[PDB]
Assembly symmetry: D2
Homo-oligomer: 344 residues x 4
C-alpha cells in the first residue's frame, strides 16, 4: 500500500512528482487551491478524462488539512506548496511567512492530530536560499545558514520545525535542500524561463526587447525532472536524513542569456554599465536586452554552488541533465510553444 | 481625476468592471494573487493588444486580502477615489469545506480593507463598494426580497458575507465613510467560472455538440434562481458610487427560472430536445432525436443546505439610479451556449 | 457522566459557571491563556482550599481561540458533554481600536471551536452554548426586544458576535448539532471587570469612602441599560442546555436604569447625596453634605456610536425554562458597593 | 527628544526597562493586552496616581500596531513582547509562531509603513535558545544556531527577519542575544522562581513538597535588572551590531535547588534515579522535592554558557550580580512576600 499526498501539486515539481509516483503505481493525492479560473494546467493530462485525486485546500486553513489527511491516510507526504518567488516575498512578506513558515507547522501538527506520527514519511522542500550570504564554498549539509529575504527566513523556520518534529516525536521527516531546478514548466517569472520565452518570441518576430536585473548573479542550475526523483529516494532511505541536491556547476545570469540567444543564431555583446547596460546582437545591431533596477533585490544572493557528495554516496543519486542541455531544451520548447500559439 | 482600486479583478465581475471604467477614462488598478501559473486570462486583452484609447490606464499589484501590510502599501501608493471590493472565495458549496478560509477572506478581509482606508487618512476622500449577495437572504423572510427584508444566511459563505455587510455599514455610520452594499442576485456570462451551474451546463452542451463529450451530471435539478448578465450588473456598481448619498440597493431581474429549464433551453440551441425519465437520483435526460442520454444526477453536487425562493425587487434601484437590466433569460442562455461552442471549437480544453 | 469544557473560565461569567456546575457534580475543564502574571484570581478559590465536595473536579488547559490545533487537542482529550463558549474580547469601546483582533476571537474563534467538534466526531454527542449579547440589537428595531426582533449591530463587537450567532445556527441546521444562543443583556456582580461602567462606579465610590480617592470621571451619564446579576444568568445557560430541543433565548430583567441613577444610588450607600450642576461636558456631581465634587465628565469615555433603548422580553425563557431573575437593581448596587468597600478596606489596590 | 515604545511592558524585562528609561527622563510608551482582570502588577507603581503611557494592543493585530507607532513616533523601539515559556510552546506552537515569529515582522513592517525607517532604533529580544544543541562551548556571536523547540524556531525566524531589515533598508536594528536572566519579578512558571517560591513557603509552613523535571540541565543565570541596561547600551552604539549578554558561569538546576534550601537551613541529599529521584532534608528526614516526567521537554537544551567578550569591549558592559547573590535575593524576597501574604 503506497499512498502519497502532495501539497502544491499544481506547481512545477508537483506535476513531475505526480507522474513519477503514478508510474510506480502509487495512489497520488493533491491539494489544490480554489481559483476563479483554471489553475491545473500542468497536471490536467493525468485525468484519463483515476489514480490521482485532487482536494480543495490551503496551507493556512487548519481544519481542512486535518480533514484531508484523515480522509486519505497517506504513507508519504510531500510538502511542496509555498509562495516560491524570492522577489515577490519582499512586498508580500507576511503572506509568505504565513504559508511557507507557519504552513509547514500546520501540516506537521495535522499529522500528529490524526495519530499518524509513526506511520507516515514526510518530505520538506527546503532550498539553497538558506545559505544566502554563503559561509562556505561550496555549500554542504553542515554549512551555516544566513538567509537574505523574507522567503529565506520563512524557509529557515520551516527547516527547523521539521527537525524538531523528527527529534521530539521520532517522525520520519527530512529536509531536501535542493538548489535551483528549471524546466519547460518553470514559472514564467523566474530568470531562466523569462529568458527562454523572450528569446523564443524574438526569433519568431513576436518581441524585440526584454528587461532583467542583476546580470552578474551566479546560480547552480539543474533539471526539475531529475530532482523530484531525489525526493522519493530520500523517503526510501533507512534513516531520515537531510540532503543537498545540486549539480556542482556555476554559471551567471549573463551566460544564460548568451547561450539562449546563441540557439537562435544571435551573438550578444554588452555595452554600458550597471542599470544602463544593454545587450546588442552582433549580427544585426538590434538591442534585445536592457537592465532595470526594479528587478534587483534589496539584499541579493550573489553566489551559489552545491556539493551533493552525501547524496551521491548514501542514495546513489546523480544529476543526468547539465547546464548546456538545459538551456537548449528550454529555448527549443518555448519556440514550439510560441510558434503554435503566440498568446502562450 | 478618477482612479479605481479593484480587488478580485481577475474574476468575472472584475474583468467587466475594468472594461467599463477604462472606457470612461478612469485609471484602473487591480490586486492579483501570486500564482504558479498564469491567472489573468480574463483581463489579458486589456494590457496586451489594447485599443489606442486606454492603453496605459491599467496597473496590477501583487496582494492578498489576508495580508494587512500589502493592502496599506497599495492603498497609500495608489490613493484611489473609488474602491470596489470584489475579491472573495465565491463558491457556496466549497465554503462548507473551506469555512475558515472563507471567513478570513470574505469577512475579516473586508475589515482589513476598510482599516487600510482609515490608516491612510482617506476616510473622507474615497468611495467604497462592497460586493454583497442575495445569499444573505438564505431562508427568505419575504417574497420577493427588497432592501428592508431581514437577513438569515444558510452557509459559511452567507455568514461571512453577513459580517462584511454590517462592518461596511458600521464604517458608514461611525466615521461617515461613503460606503455601499450591492445586494446582487445571481449574474452569469461567457466568463463565469466553470464550477457554477450555468457555465457548467453551457460548456458541457457545447462539448457534446462537437463530439468531445457524451454525458454530464448535475445535483438538484429543481433548484430555481434569479439570473442576470454580469455586464449589466457591473454598471449598477458604478451608478451606486455616483449617487448623491451612500445607499444599499438590490440588483436583480425579478424573473426566476429552474436549472432544469436552463438545461432544456441550452440543449435546444444545439438541435436536441430533452425528455426526463426516471425519478430522484436515477433521473436522466435523454435526447428525443437520437435516444442518447446526456444528463444524469449525482448526489455529490448537493449541499448541506439549500436556498429557496429567490426573487429580487429592485424598484429602489430603478427610481434612484435609473438602472434596469438589458439582458433576459432567453438571450443569456443563447449567448453562453453560442460562446462556448466557438471557444471549444477552436480549442478543446477551455 | 457530566463533563464541561468552558472557554473564558477566568472571566466573570465563567468563574460563576464553574462554581454552579461543580456544585452539581460536573467535571469541569477550562481553557486559560498563557500570561506573564497570574490571571486566575476569580477561580483560585476552587482548586486551592476547596470544599470536600468537588475537590479534584476542575482541570485547566493552556489554549487560545486563535490556535486551531490546541482546540482540537483539548476537545479530543476531554471529550465533553457540554461546551460553553464564553471566551471573547468583551469590551465594546476597546473593539473600535482592536477591531481585527476582536473579529478573530469573537467571530472566527467560534467557528474554530465548532470545527473542532466536527473534526473529533462529537457532533452528535455534545451540547454547545454560545454567549450572545443584546449588543446584536444595536439600533433597536422593536421595544422591547425578543427572540424574533431583527438584528442591527452598531460596533465591531456587535458585528463579530453577529457572525458567531449565525455560524452557530448554521451548524445547528446543517449538521443537527445541539447548539443554542444565549441572548443575554448586561449582567454585573462583585467580579465584573473594572473597565465596565458599574464596577467602575462601585470601586471608585468605595475608594472615596475610605479616603483613598477624591474624584472620578465618566462619559455619557444619560445612557440606560437593562441590568441583572451574573450569578442568576449563568443558571439560564445551564437550563438552555437541559432543554429537550435547542432554542435561542433572551435573558434580561426587563427593567431599565440610567448610569446617572446608578451613581446616585451608589453614593447613597456611602452616606452622600449627589446633586448635579453644570451642563454637558462641564456637568459635575457634588455631595450635598460636604460640598465636595466627586464626579466629572470626560469626553474620552464616549464611543463612536451608542446603543439606545435596551429592554429585554424573556417571556419565552419563563415558559420553556421556568427561569426568572432573583436579584433586582437596588440589591445589585447595594451588593456591589458593599463588596468593594470590604475589598478595598483590607487592601488598597483592587 | 527621547521617546521609547516597549512591547511586553507588563513582563519582567519590560517593567525594569521602563524604570531605567524613565529615570533617564525618557517618555516611555507601552503596549498592553486587554485582560478580563488586572495584568499590570509589575508597573502600576509607575503611575503617580505621567511620563508613562499605556496603549491597548497585540502583536497579531496589524492595524493597531500602525496606529500606535504613528501616534507615538518613537525614537527607540524595544520588542520584548512574546510567548516566552519554552515548555508551553510545545503544546502552543501555532500561537507561539504567530506572536514570536510573525509578530516581529508585523512590527518592522509598521515602522516602514509609517515612514520611520531612517529615524527609529529597534531592539529585538533574542535569546540563547537559538543555540539549542550547542555547536561550540562557550557560545559567542558567531556560533551556529540549532534551536530545540517551537519557541526556538520562532525566535530564529525573528532574528533573521531583523537582520534582513537592517541589511536591506539600513534600519538601525539589533539582536540582543541574552542568556537567562531572573529576578524577584520572574514568572512563577520558570524553574528559578518555582524553586524560590516553593522553598520560601516550606520555610513558613505553607507547603511541604514540590515537583520538578530534568534536574541535570545547566544554565547561565544573570540578573534581569543588569541586562535591561545592556539593551539600552546597544542602541547607543554607533553601528547597529548583535551582542551576546551572559555571565559566563554555569550551574545545574540541581545546584539551584540545593543553594536555595541552604538559605532556609536545610541540606538536601538525593536518593533514587530518574523520575523516581527525590530530595530529602538531611536534618529532618522530610522529603521536599520529587521528580515528574510532565515537566520534561521532548527535546532538551542540556548545556548553555555565554561568552560576552564582544559586549565587554565595545559597550563597556559587565554583569554586576553573580549566581550566589541571585539565589539569596530571590529566596529572601519570596519569604517576605509569602510572610505578609500567603496567597502570593
Ligand atoms: N524550490 C522550493 O521547492 C518547492 C518546489 O518549487 P516549485 O518551483 O515547483 O514552485 P511552483 O511555482 O511555485 O508551485 C508552488 C505551488 O504551491 C502552491 N501554493 C502556494 N501557496 C499555497 C497555499 N496557500 N496553499 C496551498 N498551496 C499553495 C501553488 O498553488 P497555485 O498553483 O494555485 O499558485 C503551487 O501549486 C517550493 O516550495 C520552492 O520553495
Ligand atoms: N458577487 C461578488 O463577486 C463574486 C461572484 O462572482 P465574481 O466573478 O465576482 O467572483 P469570482 O470570479 O469567483 O472571482 C473572485 C476573485 O477574488 C479573488 N480572490 C479570492 N481570494 C482572494 C484573496 N485571498 N485575496 C485577494 N483576492 C482574492 C480571485 O482571485 P483568483 O483569480 O486568483 O481566484 C478573483 O479575482 C462574489 O463572491 C462577490 O465577491
Ligand atoms: N457575555 C459573554 O461573556 C462576556 C461578557 O462578560 P464575561 O465575564 O463573560 O467576559 P470577561 O470577564 O471579559 O472574560 C472574557 C474571557 O475570555 C477570555 N479570552 C479573551 N480572549 C481570548 C482568546 N483569544 N482565547 C481564549 N480566551 C480568551 C479571557 O481570558 P483573560 O482572563 O486572559 O482575559 C476571559 O476568560 C461576553 O463577551 C460574552 O462572551
Ligand atoms: N528572554 C526573551 O526576552 C524577552 C523578555 O522576557 P521576559 O522574561 O521579560 O518575559 P515575560 O514573562 O513573559 O513577559 C512577556 C510579555 O509579552 C507580552 N505578550 C505576550 N504575547 C503578546 C501578544 N500577543 N501581544 C502583545 N504582548 C504580548 C506579555 O503580556 P501579558 O502580561 O498580558 O502576558 C508580557 O508583557 C522575551 O521576549 C523572551 O523571549
Ligand atoms: N526572477 C528574476 N530574477 C532575475 C532577473 N534579473 C536577474 N535576476 C537574478 O536571477 C537570479 C535567479 O533568480 P530566480 O530565477 O528568480 O530564482 P532564485 O532567487 O534563485 O529562486 C529560486 O531558487 C530557489 C532554489 O530552487 C527556490 O527556493 C526559489 O523558490 C526559486 O525557485 C537572482 O540572483 C535574481 O536576482 C529578472 O528579471 N527576474
Ligand atoms: N455549481 C453547481 N450548482 C449546481 C449543480 N447542480 C445543481 N446546482 C444548483 O445550482 C444552483 C446555483 O449554483 P451556483 O450557480 O453554482 O451558485 P449560487 O449558490 O447560485 O452562487 C452564486 O450566487 C451568489 C449570488 O448570486 C454568489 O455569492 C456566489 O458567488 C455565486 O456567484 C444551486 O441551487 C445549486 O444547488 C452542479 O453540478 N454545480
Ligand atoms: N465602560 C464605561 N462605560 C461608560 C462610562 N461612562 C459611561 N458609560 C456607558 O455605560 C454603558 C455600559 O458600558 P459597559 O457597561 O461599559 O458596556 P456595554 O457597552 O454596556 O457592554 C456589556 O454589555 C454587553 C452585553 O451586556 C457585553 O457583550 C459586553 O461584553 C459588556 O458586558 C454604555 O452606555 C457606556 O457608554 C465609563 O467611564 N466607562
Ligand atoms: N520551567 C521549568 N523548568 C524546569 C523544571 N524542572 C526542570 N526544568 C529545567 O530548567 C531549565 C530552565 O528552565 P526555565 O527556567 O523554564 O527556562 P528556559 O527554558 O532556560 O527559558 C528561559 O530562557 C531563555 C533565555 O532567557 C528565554 O528565551 C526564555 O523565554 C525563558 O525565559 C530547563 O532545562 C528545564 O528543562 C520545572 O519544573 N519547570
Amino acid at each position: 500500500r503506497n499512498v502519497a499526498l502532495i501539497t502544491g501539486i499544481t506547481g512545477q515539481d508537483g506535476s513531475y512528482l505526480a507522474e513519477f509516483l503514478l508510474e510506480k503505481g502509487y495512489e497520488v493525492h493533491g491539494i489544490v487551491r480554489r481559483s476563479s479560473s483554471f489553475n491545473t494546467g500542468r497536471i490536467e493530462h493525468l485525468y484519463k478524462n483515476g489514480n490521482m485525486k485532487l482536494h480543495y485546500g490551503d496551507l493556512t486553513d487548519s481544519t481542512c488539512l486535518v480533514k484531508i489527511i484523515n480522509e486519505v491516510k497517506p504513507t508519504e507526504i510531500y510538502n511542496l506548496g509555498a509562495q516560491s518567488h524570492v522577489k515577490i516575498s519582499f512586498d508580500l512578506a507576511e503572506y509568505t511567512a504565513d504559508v511557507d513558515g507557519v504552513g509547514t507547522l500546520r501540516l506537521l501538527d495535522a499529522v500528529k492530530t490524526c495519530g499518524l506520527i509513526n506511520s507516515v514519511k514526510f518530505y520538506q522542500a527546503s532550498t539553497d536560499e538558506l545559505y544566502g550570504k554563503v559561509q562556505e564554498i561550496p555549500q554542504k549539509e553542515t554549512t551555516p545558514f544566513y538567509p537574505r529575504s523574507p522567503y529565506g527566513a520563512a524557509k529557515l523556520y520551516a527547516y527547523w520545525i521539521v527537525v524538531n518534529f523528527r527529534e521530539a516525536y521520532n517522525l520520519f521527516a527530512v529536509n531536501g535542500i535542493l538548489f535551483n531546478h528549471e524546466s519547460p514548466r518553470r514559472g514564467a517569472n523566474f530568470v531562466t524561463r523569462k529568458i527562454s520565452r523572450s528569446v523564443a518570441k524574438i526569433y519568431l518576430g513576436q518581441l524585440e526587447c526584454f528587461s532583467l536585473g542583476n546580470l552578474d548573479a551566479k546560480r547552480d542550475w539543474g533539471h526539475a525532472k531529475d530532482y523530484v526523483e531525489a525526493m522519493w529516494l530520500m523517503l526510501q532511505n533507512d534513516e531520515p536524513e537531510d540532503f543537498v541536491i545540486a549539480t556542482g556547476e556555476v554559471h551567471s545570469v549573463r551566460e544564460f542569456v548568451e547561450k539562449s540567444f546563441l540557439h537562435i543564431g544571435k551573438t550578444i555583446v554588452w555595452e554600458g554599465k550597471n542599470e544602463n547596460e544593454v545587450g546588442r546582437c552582433k549580427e544585426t545591431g538590434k538591442v534585445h536586452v536592457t537592465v532595470d533596477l526594479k528587478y534587483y533585490r534589496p539584499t541579493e544572493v550573489d553566489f551559489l554552488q552545491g556539493d551533493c557528495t552525501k547524496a551521491k554516496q548514501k542514495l546513489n543519486w546523480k544529476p543526468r541533465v547539465a547546464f548546456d542541455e538545459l538551456v537548449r531544451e528550454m529555448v527549443h520548447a518555448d519556440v514550439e510553444l510560441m510558434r503554435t500559439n503566440p498568446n502562450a
